[PDB]
Symmetry: D2
């Protein structure tokens, strides 16, 4: 028949795990033969997941740090990369608020359908691919890599280890470069800066990270796996079964049967160390933007795992100027990078950028009608020396690219779009 997509043998997988530096301090408690046993007789190639994960991993080592902003539409990711950024962050909060498959607006509590983040990963890749296609026919080489790696939110996995597995597999099918997984109970998941957070036992989250790595291995892509702990603020945990969690149990219980637990940096450091063999990066959620609390967490973890890369949420859920002055804000990311926070991200940047700009425009328009919009259009013209291109919305969205398709099919077509447009005539 055909040999397309034949899976590798267990031995070839094993040699890769033994010799490739990518897997240096990666623990897999399953075997290579286990991976092959799950792959069927055909392995689909996942081009964008492979390329993204590779590029992300190199970047995490070659750059002083990799930073990103949350993107919830395709055009958002295109502008992030046009503006120079080298990675995209796919916030689950933002998907909950304004981009999930239920169509509803939700708080950040794993309420939306579990395939919602994968769909947005696919959307962002499609949008980047379109900018890449448009840049090629225009000879625009100002952007080196349109296909920036995407790091996406797996939340608490929407259930057990098998829901984790399927989420990761879907994320990879959509072309994700990395994914993060937090040690909360899925059925009570919260934004790390909301209350009512409930942890799961340390070993249960190790199962989740093992499942996330298994799905990437079965899919044969080196996806970046990020472990997040919410132990800094959570005062509840589902069980005391795990001996590593028992030191923090207080004995008090809730009507639901949850266990009260002592929160803070101490559970966070211990969970980071338990997750380290199972995590390419480690992220601890914090209550404030504090370089000193971050140094304290960082140093402890590298004390046992010196090569362990970390990740930091520069969260809009912090009132930044209530806590830091302008000098500290301006150095914040650079300082974190020195401590080993190699991936830093503003989770809700898209939500705030979108909501503020539309309120600003709409309130102007409610008072001044067209004068309000022309101010925006003039700001857009001005931004073109900075590299902005979306003022010409027709080309920005592919009109010239689909013209090229139409003339490739029929060079004499009288129904192409850009010729005779007001964009060609006024821009």
């Amino acid at each position: 028949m055909s040999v397309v997509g034949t899976p590798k043998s267990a031995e070839q997988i094993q040699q890769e795990w033994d010799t490739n530096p990518r897997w240096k301090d990666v623990t897999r408690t399953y075997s290579a033969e286990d991976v092959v046993a799950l792959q069927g007789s055909v392995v689909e190639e996942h081009t964008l997941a492979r390329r993204g994960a590779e590029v992300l991993w190199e970047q995490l080592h070659d750059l002083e740090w990799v930073n990103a902003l949350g993107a919830l539409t395709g055009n958002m990711a295109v502008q992030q990369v046009r503006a120079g950024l080298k990675a995209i962050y796919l916030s689950g909060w933002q998907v909950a608020g304004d981009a999930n498959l239920s169509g509803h607006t939700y708080p950040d509590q794993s309420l939306y359908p579990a395939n919602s983040v994968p769909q947005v990963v696919r959307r962002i890749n499609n949008a980047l691919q379109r900018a890449d296609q448009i840049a090629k026919i225009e000879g625009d080489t100002s952007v080196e890599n349109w296909l920036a790696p995407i790091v996406a939110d797996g939340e608490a996995g929407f259930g057990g280890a098998l829901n984790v597995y399927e989420l990761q597999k879907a994320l990879i099918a959509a072309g994700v470069a990395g994914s993060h997984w937090e040690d909360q109970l899925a059925s009570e998941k919260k934004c790390g800066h909301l209350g009512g957070k409930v942890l799961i036992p340390t070993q249960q989250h190790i199962r989740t990270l093992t499942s996330a790595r298994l799905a990437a291995d079965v899919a044969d892509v080196p996806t970046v796996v990020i472990a997040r702990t919410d132990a800094e603020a959570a005062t509840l945990i589902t069980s005391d079964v795990d001996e590593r969690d028992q030191p923090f149990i207080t004995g008090e219980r809730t009507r639901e049967g949850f266990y009260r637990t002592k929160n803070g940096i101490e559970p966070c450091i211990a969970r980071a160390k338990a997750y380290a063999p199972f995590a390419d990066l480690i992220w601890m959620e914090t209550g404030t933007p504090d370089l000193e609390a971050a140094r304290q967490f960082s140093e402890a973890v590298k004390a046992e795992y010196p090569d362990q890369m970390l990740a930091y949420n520069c969260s809009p859920s912090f009132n930044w100027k209530k806590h830091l002055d302008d000098a500290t804000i301006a150095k914040f990311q650079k300082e974190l990078a020195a401590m080993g926070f190699k991936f830093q991200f503003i989770t809700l940047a898209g939500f705030h950028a979108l909501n503020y700009s539309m309120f600003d425009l709409a309130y102007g328009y409610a008072q001044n009608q067209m004068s309000a919009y022309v101010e925006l259009q003039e700001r857009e013209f001005a931004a073109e020396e900075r590299g902005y291109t979306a003022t010409k919305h027709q080309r920005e969205v592919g009109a010239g690219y689909f013209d090229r398709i139409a003339t490739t099919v029929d060079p004499n077509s009288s129904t192409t779009a850009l010729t005779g447009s007001t964009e060609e005539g006024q821009f």
Copy 2:
């Protein structure tokens, strides 16, 4: 064996068409008994489509005009209402560019799946409903009508009269208030400011408008029907069958078999007059923002149909200051409204606000990291004086509303969200 949703009698519908001022100069070439024959034995109520269409009809007569901005996400629509706007425009261009069900970025050429605009109508209504629910528990009466009427883009119907019918039916199921339909060939559809436009015969567009009205009648809701002509710039038409079109046919053909046709305001005036018995509002696409041309179109149509309301596209596809001075720009919508342009809209407002604001934030972030974001957050704090609420993003997307559900189910729940949040603590 229930009375729920029993359809009306023919006589009942007929009497409504005869007596309700809503149908003053509305021609239906089909009968009431034709409508009943298509309704089965159960007629689903469409609450939001009914309320939206009735509210929209009133505002078109009570206000001096109705204006709106394009919205491509739910949060966008929420901010427009929060800022005082009383209607939402749902642009098909923006759906093609950044919000359609294929996942791809597309030029405005009817490339996306035909149920994409219905899905966004449903999304916007869900979002406005969430805001309405939150305001109610917060005792916030600052907005009188959260459920602003949505006017949505039907494009060229994505095919024949039955595709038109199904699109209108889906728009109504999602809660649309009004829909607009243009006289282009669906297979060659363009943004009215792109080239390569192909008109369809006058009678074929009357068929489209009749099908949109029938679908609203069968759905038993008074949807506002908007007729759009693209004849100002189109120099192609599919056929010379219609005697009303023949005066502008030149006899030149293209290789695809299209007919060349003399473009300009004269064909728009003739098509407008032909569409007026079938259209609640009439919309002529133009190539520049020109108050004198608008007046010429308006007076010509009103000479025959004095009560005929018009709609105008304040298009971002115009380079506005290259054509008008700030004085005229400032008075543009007010002047148009006096000529009878009672619905005016900026089609791509959402695209440009989203793309510009993200490029701006990202560009600063690339050079100054957290300092660029804190600037945005401080702008958001400032805008609270004008009624902005999204700085508190948790309550904005319904964290307090879902807490209320949670404590309604279990008042002693230990896992509610706002108590202990950094938002409760820092905002």
Copy 3:
């Protein structure tokens, strides 16, 4: 200013609760005031949800029993109603196997996206509405109610009370007549006839049944709520916090933190008694089709709630003729109805009818090609005596209905479908 969809006042809600016999023995632990506070200023009418819930309720009291087959496509439900059944069963197992929004084939473990069953509800209603519409234009009175009530699977709620609330809300929006809810941990959910099941505490399932009733009340519809218990086979429970479950707790614990518990009919009886004030019907999963065990459960429950209706899963996961002779199989559902099992259903009827018929067809087709298909067509022709209509597939699917739309829009249309069809000329 509009009165469309204005919410009721708490007093109206209270009076309906106190006076409607629908709510005779129904406990609500929240107030009518609470419900109103969640309704915003507009309540969408849910026509099919209201009509189907009312029809379902009346049928449960007017017929000896209501039976149903699992349906996973719209055409399936149409054929069930055409063949005389009076309710549709919407199996979550079948959705996981062959009709969920991930696009993947899954075992029955709550792996698919949580809006999947709602989408199939909406689909089934659309298909029944089409059959209804066709029947009207055909003058076909052979089916008195095409819109048969749909009873759909809400599984273990896909998370907490809030995930339950959103699933019930989406089911109602899609037009469901009733939904069922089982006392398993969502993250380890199983088909009742699979091993490895984990119970939640009795109170937590009461919270679920309360959440489901609350969403029905906030959506202003009398949805039938079914409580399912999995305690006949489950030997694991998440916690020993509820004193009603402690008598069955052994005290040993698993690595996951689960508690071993003594399974069988006695925990089912106790749980059923605890659920009775919050469930319109009660369902205990069993390991075999056994009338004697069903009698035991019915007698025990009814000894305290004599008017409590029960549901029974006539499961294809039983090897029927391994456990009963043809005489017992023939009387099975009649005997169950005499014991109060008023809703009875074959969950996987659609999966087995679909899978066997296609294997049988394809096997014959591989062997004798067209001869195998002609055998099917001839059986279809022979079934017309019994009322089968789908041999004429064009009309079955609405070609004549859309011809009626087409000729309503344009009575002179030269592109209608059934005239000149091979169906008109060969059938």
Copy 4:
């Protein structure tokens, strides 16, 4: 900065076109450079579309003929392969009737959203992959190739050449092996055996076929392209612009402006010869199942293109025994295969199998309840002799495969599914 998915060079593409026998008689009116120009800087690999197309092309040359049945769910394709079939047919008609993204039941008139068939391609592939995964862990080698090639319906492209391009690209991404395209007007598209069909000019369908090859070239996969002509029965055409269609134009016109045209075998032969350079297989719809008419068509076409493979629709829209005796029926497909009809398919097999099997079961269940279902279950047990496996529905849908995933993550998990199941205990 990665070599993953680096596009081939134009010279590499040219060499394959010049030297690979797959492209022997394939005309491309565009260039290899035009293909690279559209590829961006990264080309995603489409494993299933590549493997499927390669297997399909091989099977069309190795086997006496390749026959298929229409499949509208994943389980349907699984049973077709289990029973020995080597290809799957994906019918646009069936998607309209029971499996499209609108949720509605439609007649076969391109009413559904244009990404519906790609979604079903992706679904079928997912379902075959799961059967493949299950077979591997079961040690089941009874099926040589679970990933049977999929031939899917592109209808009339849902618009112009760019709609055609996007549908082919979406079909490829979902993993299709071949796609067929008909010379009908998209806005008036019909099932070949409905009336009211409108042809488009010969050259316009060459543009569609060229557009379909271009998309496969840009996606770097050798998708099989089938050309369908509806000219046997269609009496209307949009235009007389093409001199190849003028021999049949009568001069009369309809009120819509369509041209009446003389239908039959003669325009079909002229159109097949025009399409042959742009089609891997050629299909003419017929009004009856007639071996002599089929013979005449093949001989006339092969008279000029001796190697041109043909495709034939064994349509359930024929009343088979009304036209043919059992002997002709039994030999029909073999006879066609000797004429060059290498792909033969029963389009609506799934619709009729699904509809008849559910009516039959439900009618029996209405009369005799469980006796009727046990009759089916016993037939399923009996079919196991023939290779049927779905009586064990738990493993059929992957309960064993997900158990293997669960015990790869945690070998001592206490929540696996098949151990303790009734399927293990009773089957």
